[PDB]
Amino acid sequence: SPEQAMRERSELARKGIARAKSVVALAYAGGVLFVAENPSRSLQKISELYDRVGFAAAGKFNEFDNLRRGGIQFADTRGYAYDRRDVTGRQLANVYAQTLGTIFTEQAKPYEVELCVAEVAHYGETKRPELYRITYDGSIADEPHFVVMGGTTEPIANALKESYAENASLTDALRIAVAALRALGVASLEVAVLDANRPRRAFRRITGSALQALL
Amino acid sequence: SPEQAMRERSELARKGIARAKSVVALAYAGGVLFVAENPSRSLQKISELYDRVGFAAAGKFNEFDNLRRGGIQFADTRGYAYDRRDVTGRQLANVYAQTLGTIFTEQAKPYEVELCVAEVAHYGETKRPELYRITYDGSIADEPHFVVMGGTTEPIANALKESYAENASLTDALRIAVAALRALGVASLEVAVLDANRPRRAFRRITGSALQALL
Amino acid sequence: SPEQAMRERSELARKGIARAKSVVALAYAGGVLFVAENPSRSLQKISELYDRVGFAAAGKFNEFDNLRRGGIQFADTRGYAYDRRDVTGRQLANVYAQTLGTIFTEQAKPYEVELCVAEVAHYGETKRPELYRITYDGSIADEPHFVVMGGTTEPIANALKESYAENASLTDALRIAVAALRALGVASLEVAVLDANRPRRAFRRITGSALQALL
Amino acid sequence: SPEQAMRERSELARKGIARAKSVVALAYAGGVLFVAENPSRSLQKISELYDRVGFAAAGKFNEFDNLRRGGIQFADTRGYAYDRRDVTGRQLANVYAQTLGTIFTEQAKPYEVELCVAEVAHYGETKRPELYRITYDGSIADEPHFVVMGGTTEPIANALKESYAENASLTDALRIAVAALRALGVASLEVAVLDANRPRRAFRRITGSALQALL
Amino acid sequence: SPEQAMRERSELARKGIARAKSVVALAYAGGVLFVAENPSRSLQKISELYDRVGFAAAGKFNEFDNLRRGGIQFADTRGYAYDRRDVTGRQLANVYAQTLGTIFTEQAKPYEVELCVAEVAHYGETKRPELYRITYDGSIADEPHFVVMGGTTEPIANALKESYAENASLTDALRIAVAALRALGVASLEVAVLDANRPRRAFRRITGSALQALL
Amino acid sequence: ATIVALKYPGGVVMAGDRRSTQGNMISGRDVRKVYITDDYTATGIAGTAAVAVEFARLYAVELEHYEKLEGVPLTFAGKINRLAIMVRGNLAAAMQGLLALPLLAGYDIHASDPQSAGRIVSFDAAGGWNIEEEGYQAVGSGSLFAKSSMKKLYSQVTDGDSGLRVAVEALYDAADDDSATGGPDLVRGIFPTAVIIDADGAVDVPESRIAELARAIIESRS
Amino acid sequence: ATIVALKYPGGVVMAGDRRSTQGNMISGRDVRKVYITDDYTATGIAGTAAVAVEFARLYAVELEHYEKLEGVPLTFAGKINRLAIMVRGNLAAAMQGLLALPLLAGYDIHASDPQSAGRIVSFDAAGGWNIEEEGYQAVGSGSLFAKSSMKKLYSQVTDGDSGLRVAVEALYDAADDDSATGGPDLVRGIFPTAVIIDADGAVDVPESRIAELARAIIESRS
Amino acid sequence: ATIVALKYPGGVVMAGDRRSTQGNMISGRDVRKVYITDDYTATGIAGTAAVAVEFARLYAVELEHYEKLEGVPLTFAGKINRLAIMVRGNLAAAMQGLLALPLLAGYDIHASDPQSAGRIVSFDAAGGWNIEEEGYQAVGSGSLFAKSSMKKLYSQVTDGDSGLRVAVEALYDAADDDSATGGPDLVRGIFPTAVIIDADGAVDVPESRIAELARAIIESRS
Amino acid sequence: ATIVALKYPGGVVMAGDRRSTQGNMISGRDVRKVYITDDYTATGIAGTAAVAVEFARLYAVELEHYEKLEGVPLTFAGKINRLAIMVRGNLAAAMQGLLALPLLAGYDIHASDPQSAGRIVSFDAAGGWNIEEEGYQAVGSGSLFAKSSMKKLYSQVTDGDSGLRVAVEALYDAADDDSATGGPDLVRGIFPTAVIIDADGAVDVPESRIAELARAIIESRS
């Protein structure tokens, strides 16, 4: 009976993600903001993939770390084979959806992860940021405003469905997301942005007293 | 018991397609018209395969995206090996039926997709358009007037079985199909045509205010 | 039913580690201290991996001996390919988490082991020691003060959660850990340190009358 | 259910060894003494592996004969690759534990054997003999005085736990072990020693009237 | 449950051999005597392997014919690689035990055969003949006087346990074995000897009127 | 055989001769060596008709295959990289006597200044490529004579017609100096083929315009 | 072709000429041979534009790929080892007529004395590498003339401007002695390219500074 | 290039010169060719800096890898066998023009007589090895002159200082007779490098001791 | 290099010289070329120390491995067959300049007549082997002189001492005629090495017996 097996694998994966912590991504005036609860400075939940593409994940660390390494390898090979400007976040989201669907179907235990891919416009260009959410079974959805993954997402999703303001500042957006995650100081928080104003590499981490000032 | 397993796999696939959205293809005076409900400008349900061959699908995005990439690869290789005029939509429909039957039989989970292949006549020639419908188990059927896939198809099939007029204009056919899908503005609609009047490449997308005018 | 199989494999592994003896790792002023109960001078539970990286394990001897040999091979290859200063304990902990997760998922019987990786700062540098704990299913956690593995860990964990003093001496820390394991003379005890004051290789064993004096 | 399968395989192996005959190894003043009940002069239970390493086994003949041939091959290759003095009994005991654990886990039927590896000091050196016992599932233990394998071992283990005298003579130790096995003349007994006084090869068999005199 | 499967496979093999006919091997003054009931002059149960090694079997013809061909190939290769005098019946019995154990464990149906290997001394030498019995599961036993395989063996085993005389003549031994099999003329009997008096090849068949005279 | 390319304000022009030779024997009089490969690029290989048509066919298939898979066309740098990979994967066969050196002309639509968006790329035997900065380039056996003619005539180029005229005159000079290059054939009516790429795309130049330009050059030199 | 590198107090400077040749024929006048590969290193290969740009592209991809996977940049010794592996994996092709010998310049930020943190590494055909201790190095066909000029001029280097001036003068002497190296072109306005690496990172030197320095050298030699 | 090794009562000493050459051209003045590979052994390869450092790096990695896996260091015979395997696995490349012949010096701690525990092992091109019994050995292009000098000077060796002095004098004689070997450079202050291995382990000899010994030899020969 | 073997009533004796050469240059003075391989056989290879020791090491490992697996030692014919396989598997390398031709001496304990149980086996380049029937054999570059000396001296052999004396005298004659063979060195005290195999097994001959025999031969020839 395929339907029973599919239901059980889905239930296992959704229990796995339900016991994890929450990471939220928000589109603001200068790009995309990543905020996650991470009491460890050594195991990171947010990373960069290419010049204007960002990575975020929730769930089991080793599974999405393997996924992040594979995505970096794919992006580097594609950029070297064709050229740098020919690498977009849509291709990465598609390749992630294919590999997660294959893992869900063929492997003994599915991956208990939820992924998000973010892209920003190139330097000196005006384009709305894109957020893609990839689910454990391979479903891919395109989100215009924000993505919430991990833990209990309904209260955070409501606290962000209200009070979200387009073209907000970095400080206001950071405060808003920090408020929404409670439905946390410099420690236990991992924060990164994709800065559209940067010439080539848009990814940078906000750590230490610089993060303290903006809170 | 093979019969129980086949029944369960068929039921799983038909539930999968039943929860998806509807895409309809119609033959009109200038070729073939593709109309689908798609609230995303980034993940496309309608695509081209070769110079006069079109692609449409319904169901899980990653599965039919993989199928579309494979069909493009097959058509390009065949056109380069023999020549361009030796590539027809019948061969593509046959290769799709073979691969869907193999997936339905050998793989753990069948593909929850429904495909349609459309071809138009070459430039300066008169030939009726052909529509092929390929089903998840590999069944292939040839349709003379229209194909409806995805969601609940009986009311749409009736609303098109009536009011369909051969040799209709682009505007009338577009309005008729938009009416039939309701049994939707510029957003949430993906529209493409196969234009028989074009010299080589018959595929073109109707987007923005140009689509707004024709509604 | 995947959930029943996962529960049974986890129960088997946790029974396996529950019947083993206890090893504890503690961060002190001069580095990291390893103390384990081992009545055999011939089969060792504590080993070195690289210049500033240490290894400790609990459970079935042959499984973690195989893991230790694989980690030594990985560290030596990485150090030769890039350079020596480019090898850290984080990479080893990640590779151990990946291999333990793969063994837990694909193999007939999971490994009944618990691992700990310790690193200290390079010579003439000031950095807090890091302790990583890797669990049989592949979970990786980062511990700031101490790690207790094997046997009954709750009483030892309490006896160390109290009386632990940062920047303690070697003698005081050794006495404290020896006291905590009881919740043992020169024989039946294996003791090693990672000495941050050493120029290149930080690992050394304390055996014989030298261990007797420090007790 | 992995626990039921593991229990059944363990029960099968322990029944298999329980129906076999007993072999005992004892450390005396001149090395290690091997005494086994063997009514056949043609199928041997005791063998040599390298210059100072000995082999003994109990259970099914073909399984431990295959193990003995593999150990001889491993020791010869290691001695030729590095050098002769770099081959110890610890490496052989470890390789036997790994292969027995792999057979217990992956194969349809586990091996119903129990192995013992003995080493003595090199010529002109003083070091206590080492006895390693390897069990069918891959468990390895280090024994200081004696090892008893096969049949009913508790009465023999008691009859040797008493009356065992360190630094005993060959004749006294032989008589003591012959007495302990009863809880047997020249026929039905296989006797060998590892003689630490020999220059290179320490293994020699005691057969015929020479064995008769020492009884 | 491994124990149930092992019991069923053993029961199947022992039923298979129980329905076959009996072959007996006896050591006499001039070597080894083979006597079997065989109404066919075309399918032989007794064969030679090397210069002084003989083969006998009971059970399914094709299985032990395959075993006999493999043993001939092994003996010929070993004799050519090292030399002729380095091939003994012990090695053949060991290789047969290994292959029968592997077939019993890995294959779907075990072999329903029982084998016997006989060797005699080289020309101008005095050594007692050796008889090895190999059982379907791979058990190997060494017999000093006689081996009985196939059919009901207890009455034949008693009729030979009595009246057996060492250093008996060919005629007396032949008559004794012919008497013991009844618990048969020139037809329905296959008779061969290993003649220790022959210079190189000790195997010869007794057929026709020469067998009639000796009865 | 000679192909020339030059840049004018607002676009680029490429033209080649029509002769194929087997030693000293004329084997073809109507060879086409310049092909439109996509909407904004054209390629020219100095060689036989089959090599030029086959290389252009494979390159066009690769470009359209990418455009269909990804939904967008490649950038100009990506096209250069793909062509360089194809050229590099033929070095052993080139040293075995079958060497094809292409010349690429294109219009970059993502450049900030549209009047300087024309591009010319040349390749060497080892597979290396260079973007040209002087305004003209030539490949083939008469390439040195054509380049020396363009060096003196390039000051007259101000738009598409002047560039076409200078390209035809450079091909005429190459034919005048090298016998493997064919000149305008007035008896048979065969003239060089040209392609013009501008902001609207690559189009083939009609034969009568080239014929009138060549006749004016011939009467000027008489 | 010649690339020079020299160490000054607080950093390092690297510069190369702009000529490419095919035998005795000048094939390029604007070749760039020095590329910034990461925030603190630069590489220079004496050869064609394509080889230099492709080798630099592959090396930069490798360095950034490691930085993204591991979270930290490689040490200077790790960068040398990776470059040496890439150079070694090309020896058969180099003896087949395609030899690329790179020169590496960098700034080590983990050194204890920041005023001597500049590094220069050279490579040989077999793939061997050496860290230089004299303060300057040169590769290419005019490398001996440039090295003999720096041997006499190195006593004047006290900071970044003096080092840049001495590097430009050494390239001028190499061009004066060897015809495969191009000198400053005053008619066309083409000058050598330079990179300066210090504690703030590797930056490209503007063309007008090099132009003024070259003009002062030319008037001095007149 | 020349490396010398000699045995004294209680240990062994090994020293090499600092020159690297490309034909008749001096390419390096500070090459180090003697490296400590473990606590009681040192290796010297007569060649470029990269070959010596890379061979020593691989051999040290192999020795430490065994020590970490097995818990004990290899015996001296096991170390010789591993080195011989590495040397043998390079014969085709050596006949292809890249030949590296190492010299091994060590102290055996498991010998019964500690005053004769020093060892010297040489290798040939085919990969064969010999333990030396005369008390000294030399490899390189000046090895014959150095060996003939040690044959006459070896009677003066009674301890570590005498052995170091005789080794420096043998290197001086090799430099005096062969131009690929560099002598002591008093203008630049560059001297040969030496290693001493005794019962306490292998240590590097400080540069000032070698400098004073070389200066005394030079004043003696004046 | 020369190894000799001869049969006496009750056993066999084998002896070789101590010189290794690299052309005309003496490279070794203490080479051992005869090794005991098991309790009743000995092998001698005319070549360098490493080849002899390595071939003997591999052959001894093979013989002991068989003895441990099977429980009994191989017959003499089986030992010859295994040695012949090892020799045959080296013909291409031998024609590549690395040729090792062994000589085997042994005592057969299963022979019916113990006084004629000594055996001598020689090998050729192709891998063929022959059991010798004349009573003596020699391999190496002085083998012809040694064989011609044994042909005249073999009538004096009646037991082990006479055989040892005749073997030493044959080696002395080979050294007297061929310069690649070393004679007895009275200044350094180095003498040939010998092995005697009889019914009790193979033993090494002490150096003082060989020294006294060689001194008596030298005084006889004076």
Describe, in plain words, how this protein is organized in 3D.
This is part of a larger assembly, with five copies of chain A (215 residues) and four copies of chain F (222 residues). Chain A is α+β, with helices and mostly antiparallel strands. Chain A is built from six helices and ten strands, in the order αββββααββββααββα. In chain A, the strands form two sheets. Chain A has a five-stranded antiparallel β-sheet, with helices on one face. A five-stranded antiparallel β-sheet of chain A has the order 3-4-5-6-7. The longest helix of chain A is centred in the N-terminal third of the chain and has 21 residues, at 61-81. Helices cover 38% and strands 27% of the residues of chain F. Chain F contains six helices and twelve strands. Chain F has helices at residues 49-70, 76-88, 91-95, 143-153, 160-177, 207-221, and strands at residues 2-8, 11-16, 20-22, 25-28, 34-38, 41-45, 102-107, 118-123, 129-131, 136-140, 193-198, 201-204. Chains C and G meet through loops of C and helix 2 of G. Chains A, B, C, D, E: The modification Phosphothreonine is found at residues 77, 171. Chains A, B, C, D, E: This is Proteasome subunit alpha. Chains A, B, C, D, E: It is found in: Cytoplasm.
Structural class of chain A comes to alpha+beta
Strand percentage of chain F lies at: 25-35%
What is the radius of gyration of chain F?
Answer: 17 Å
| Estimated structural class of chain F | alpha+beta
The CATH topology of chain A comes to Glutamine Phosphoribosylpyrophosphate, subunit 1, domain 1
* Number of DSSP-assigned strands of chain A: 10
Series of secondary-structure elements of chain F, N-terminal to C-terminal: EEEEEEHHHEEEEHHEEH
Measured as a percent range, the helix fraction of chain F is 25-40%
